[PDB]
Amino acid sequence: MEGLAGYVYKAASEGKVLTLAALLLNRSESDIRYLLGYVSQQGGQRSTPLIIAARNGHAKVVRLLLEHYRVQTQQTGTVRFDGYVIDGATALWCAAGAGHFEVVKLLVSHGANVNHTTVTNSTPLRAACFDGRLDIVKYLVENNANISIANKYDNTCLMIAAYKGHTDVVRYLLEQRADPNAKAHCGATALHFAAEAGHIDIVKELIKWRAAIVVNGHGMTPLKVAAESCKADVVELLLSHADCDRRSRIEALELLGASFANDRENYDIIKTYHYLYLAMLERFQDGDNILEKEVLPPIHAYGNRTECRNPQELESIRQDRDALHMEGLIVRERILGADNIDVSHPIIYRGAVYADNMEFEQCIKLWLHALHLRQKGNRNTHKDLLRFAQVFSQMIHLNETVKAPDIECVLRCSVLEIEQSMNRVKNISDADVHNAMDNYECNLYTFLYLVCISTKTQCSEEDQCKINKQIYNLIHLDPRTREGFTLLHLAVNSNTPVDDFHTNDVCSFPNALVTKLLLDCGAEVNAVDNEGNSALHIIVQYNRPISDFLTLHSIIISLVEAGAHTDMTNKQNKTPLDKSTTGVSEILLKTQMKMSLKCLAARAVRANDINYQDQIPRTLEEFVGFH
């Protein structure tokens, strides 16, 4: 019974003995075994009563459960509540993850599950290393558990120990003669995770065991990984590997100076200049076998600079801050390439800094470059398109002109990324289909914000034609949200979410300009959602008919002139006149209705429930369907 299961879960949550003893006796065998071997669903998550016993440090209740019964720890449950909450894990997994040693040792003493393999084949040693307790790890390995359990994405416990700040766990793991050259799915071998959080002692521990330097999948050494994240101390330690070479040393120093220029946590422009100057001096130190810079061609996004191939020009850009920011961006682009994961974020941060200082055009250039790089890498840019929608709505609210080619470029990027989001939704069945669905809906909303911005900006005929071409291209994919809303419906709806940032000032739905633009670009004016409501069924339900009657009037004129049916019914057989719920919308629609005998006859057919299948033209079966 689920009720008595909840009762014994509540009894074991408080760590009591007599309550559970009274609540787990005077029954048969099978029901008691089911009670001790089934999970209770609390807070939307299923968990064993042993899970809540071990999580609160109540080891006495589970110890006496093991004494009085033969309860096992092999029950399937969640992993941890800190943003993972995936099932498949055993009770000993979260017992190790709860940071309680005595419950772990008593669960090992009766039916050890040290070699548990979940859907991620994560042993309880994984959670023990994540928590960072030496005793649990020591005992669990002493229980004859293999430490070389590689995941499907090859996440050794040493990797998660190196990523975290728990140096005791990783030093004990390397004291057991573990593999230091552990390859991962992305190629990151231990040191790449260690020198990413700036853990100097862990990196020293692995260099002592000679973890070796090897390039990962993304073309980044552990030294370049360290220099990418502004962590100077691990860069120092990795630059003394006794095999480092000049080219790697200077590129690491240049990367460190680059990373210090554009970062939120570590922003020092004096460190940027000093590390760039140190790398340049160490470049031009000898005059023989000199290492000149292989300068990339200039990029319009970072102004028009061409790096700094001489110490004199680096000296001249010492006190000029934005030149140093651009210089750091360009040398970071050179070192990490145009196809790395982390090369795009500092560009976005510099764009955000430029936008906060009301310098908008260079902000747009930088963010467009970041968008182009992220789309070449085929990455989720639904946050970047929203960022464009926010900054474009910040210039319009500030009465600043928006460049038409910039709007065209971001609209083309939005259309392409909505295409790839549709492909992502189609390909992924149920792995992360909710996240992809939310990204798809957010991308549709950001496209609508960009179109609304494009309506309020004066453009040339060619640029307006290109914008209309992009909108046309998106329309002829028929993008639909969860509840069947096409791209026209959301521009018609009043419940369409507008982002709480500066987009509220410029983007207001319903919008008569967006609807007119979509209908001119060929939107299906008679398209229906999942509920059957067309574009006209949603505009009539608008609850502010008089405050923006100028908006409400023009959109109904545009919808009817585009060819909407002023009579068709949804799944509930409700004409928009009946679904008008407003006198003003009803008057406007009755003014705009054009009467037809076909509509009246089909309405009479539908009202009288006359069998029309195989008695009418096939093209007229649909007409009976909505009329």
């Binding site: 992993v79 941890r80 993972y84 995936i86 993850g97 991620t120 994560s122 994984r126 959670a127 290393c129 994540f130 994405y153 996440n155 998660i160 990523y163 991962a184 799915h185 992305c186 939120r264 974020h345 976005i348 941060y349 764009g351 955000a352 800094v353 936008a355 906060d356 960022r387 926010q390 900054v391 940032f501 500066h502």
Partner: peptide
């Protein structure tokens, strides 16, 4: 509202 402060492998950082 301060674009810079608004800014901000997930399956691999799982234990």
């Amino acid at each position: 509202k301060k674009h810079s402060l608004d800014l901000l492998k997930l399956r691999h950082l799982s234990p």
